[PDB]
Design a protein around this ligand. Structure first.
Ligand SMILES: COCCOc1cc(Cl)cc(-c2cc(-c3ccccc3C#N)cn(-c3cccnc3)c2=O)c1
Ligand SMILES: COCCOc1cc(Cl)cc(-c2cc(-c3ccccc3C#N)cn(-c3cccnc3)c2=O)c1
Lengths: 299, 299
C-alpha cells in the first residue's frame, strides 16, 4: 500500500540525452539513432526571429553535439516545426524502443530534467487543460523531455522550450508542434485560465479508497448532468460518459459506482475537508490518471 | 522556477536490479560486482524464524538469480545481519560507482520500486523520525532499494523488507541493519509516534520564497528557545543550532534570517493557512531537506 507521485524509471531516456551547442547557446538534445532533436531556438541570439533565415545562415559546423565526453559530428541539419533535427555520424547504441506521441490535456508523463546534457532529476507532471505544465525547470533545461513507458517502449510526448512569466512551462511534442497557442518567441504570451482535471480527481479518490481513506464517502448518488453543474461552478472540467467508462475497472474493484463517487466530490467541493486529509493531501489532487492509479495500486 | 517532488535519475540503479528466487518465494535483489544482496526473509516460508537454521539447510542451488533473461549461477551465500549476500559467477558490468550509507532520520532518498527484478517506478521519500518510510509498495517489492546520487556515485541507503499493518514501510541499510526497532518476523510491531521534520519544513518555506510565495512572511522574529516551545506543542522536532547553521545558505540567498522564518512557521502552526497554499500544498511539507531545496532551486 501507500500512494506516491511516481515517475517511470528514467534509465532508457538518460542514455539518449546529449548537449547541443550553437554559438553562445547551450541546451539539451535527444539522441535517437543517428538523429539529435532539440529546440530550434538554440540558433537564436529573438524578440521576433525568422527561423528560416537563422537556419539558412548556419552550417553543420555551427552545431557542437557532445554525448558523455565524446563530440558527435553533425552531418546534416533540418527544421521540423519548432524542433531542430541534427543528423550525426554515429547512431546512439543505447537507443530504446521508442515512439513519438502527442498527448491530450489531462494526461500525465515523467520529466527528466537535464542540464548540459546531464540528467538532474525525474518527476511526474500532467499536461494542464490550458496546455502548460507545472514543471520544475532552471536555466539550461530546454530540450529536456517528458515521456511514458509502456512495457519497454518509451513514448516521448514533450520537449521543454519556455518558461512563461507565471513560472509555468510550455513546449512541444517531439515533432515540434507546441502544445497550446504558444510560439517560440520572446513576446507577451499568457496561458488560458486553467481548470481542474475532474476524471483524475475521481481516479485519485478511488486510489484513496483502495488505501483505506473513506471518511469522504457517502450514501448519496448524483446524475452526470447534476454533477457537471457543480463542476462548472468550481472550475472543474466537465465529466463525460467516456470518463465514466474509463473509470470502470476502479469502480468495480472498489464496488463504488462512478456516480456515487461523484456525490463525494460534490460534498468535498461544497464543504471542503474540515481539517482532514486524503492520501496525505489537504486538497484535491488531479495529476493522477485512472491508468496511473491502476498501475500503482494493483500493478 | 517551479518546485516538484523530484527523485534522482534511476538508470544507474536499474542496471543493478535482479530477481532472486528461493523455493516458492520471489523478490528483488541488488547485483553489484559479483555479489547479489536481498532480504534474508527470501529463505522463509516465519512467525518466529531462526535464520541461522534456515540458512544452514540451504545450498547455492536453492537460489535462482535472474538478471534480465540470463540466469546467474550462485557460487556462495552468506548472511550479514538481515541481508542475504549471494556470490555469483559473473560481475555485473553495469556496476556504478557506489557506496553503502546509513542515513539519519529526516534525510530523503529516491526509491526504485521493482517487481520480479524489473523496475516499476521511482519516487522520493524521507526517513521518518520514527524510522519508517511512507512508501508505495505492493506484494513482491521487497528488495527494492533507496538511494541518493552525488556527482556520479550511487549511495545506497535503504532496502525494503516489510509493510507494517498501518501501511508504512520498514527496511534496512545495505549492510542489513534495520532502521528503527523492527525485526524481520511476522509478529506484532508498532512504530513510535511520528513527528514532523522541522528543519525540512523551514527549507521548504525557503523554497517557496525562492519561487515567489510570500503571503506567510512577517516582520516578527523569535528566539530558538521560544520556537521550540511551539514546536513541541505541535509535535514538531526540536530545531537545533546545527539546523540553523545548515539553513545558512538559504537564509542568505533569500535574505531571510532563519529565526525570522521560524516566526512564520509559528503563525502557520497557530493560525493555519486560511485557504491559501504554498508551492501547491495546503499543508506544511517536510520531505525536502535543505540540500534538496538548493539542488532543485539553484542547481
Ligand atoms: C513567452 O514566454 C516568455 C519566454 O520566452 C522565451 C522564448 C524562447 Cl524561444 C525561449 C525562452 C527560454 C530560453 C532559454 C535559454 C536561453 C539562452 C540559452 C539557453 C537557454 C536554455 N535552456 C531558457 N528558458 C528557460 C529558463 C528557465 C526554465 N525554462 C526555460 C527559456 O524559457 C523563453
Ligand atoms: C511486522 O510487520 C508485519 C509484516 O511482517 C512481515 C515480516 C517479514 Cl520478515 C516479511 C514481510 C513481507 C513479506 C513479503 C513477501 C512474502 C512472500 C513472498 C514475497 C514477498 C515479497 N516481496 C512481502 N511484504 C510486503 C508486501 C507489500 C509491501 N511491502 C512488503 C512483506 O511485508 C512482512
Amino acid at each position: 500500500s501507500g500512494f506516491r507521485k511516481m515517475a517511470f524509471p528514467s534509465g532508457k531516456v538518460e542514455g539518449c540525452m546529449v548537449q547541443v551547442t550553437c554559438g553562445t547557446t547551450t541546451l539539451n538534445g535527444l539522441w535517437l539513432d543517428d538523429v539529435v532533436y532539440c529546440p530550434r531556438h538554440v540558433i537564436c541570439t529573438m524578440l521576433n526571429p525568422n527561423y528560416e533565415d537563422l537556419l539558412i545562415r548556419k552550417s553543420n559546423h555551427n552545431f557542437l553535439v557532445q554525448a558523455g565526453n565524446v563530440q558527435l559530428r553533425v552531418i546534416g541539419h533540418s527544421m521540423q516545426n519548432c524542433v531542430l533535427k541534427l543528423k550525426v555520424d554515429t547512431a546512439n547504441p543505447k537507443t530504446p524502443k521508442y515512439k513519438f506521441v502527442r498527448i491530450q490535456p489531462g494526461q500525465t508523463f515523467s520529466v527528466l530534467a537535464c542540464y548540459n546534457g546531464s540528467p538532474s532529476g525525474v518527476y511526474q507532471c500532467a499536461m494542464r487543460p490550458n496546455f502548460t505544465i507545472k514543471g520544475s525547470f532552471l536555466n539550461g533545461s530546454c530540450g529536456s523531455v517528458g515521456f511514458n513507458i509502456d512495457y519497454d517502449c518509451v513514448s516521448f510526448c514533450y520537449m521543454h522550450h519556455m518558461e512563461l512569466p507565471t513560472g509555468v512551462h510550455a513546449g512541444t511534442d517531439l515533432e515540434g508542434n507546441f502544445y497550446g497557442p504558444f510560439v517560440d518567441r520572446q513576446t507577451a504570451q499568457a496561458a488560458g485560465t486553467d481548470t481542474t482535471i475532474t476524471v483524475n480527481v475521481l481516479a485519485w479518490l478511488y486510489a484513496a479508497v483502495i488505501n483505506g481513506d473513506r471518511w469522504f464517502l457517502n450514501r448519496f448518488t448524483t446524475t452526470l448532468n447534476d454533477f457537471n453543474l457543480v463542476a462548472m461552478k468550481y472550475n472543474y472540467e466537465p465529466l463525460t460518459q467516456d470518463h465514466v467508462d474509463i473509470l470502470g475497472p476502479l469502480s468495480a474493484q472498489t464496488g463504488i459506482a462512478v456516480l456515487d463517487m461523484c456525490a463525494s466530490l460534490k460534498e468535498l467541493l461544497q464543504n471542503g475537508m474540515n481539517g482532514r486529509t486524503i492520501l496525505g493531501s489537504a486538497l484535491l489532487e488531479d495529476e493522477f490518471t485512472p491508468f496511473d492509479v491502476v498501475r500503482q495500486c494493483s500493478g
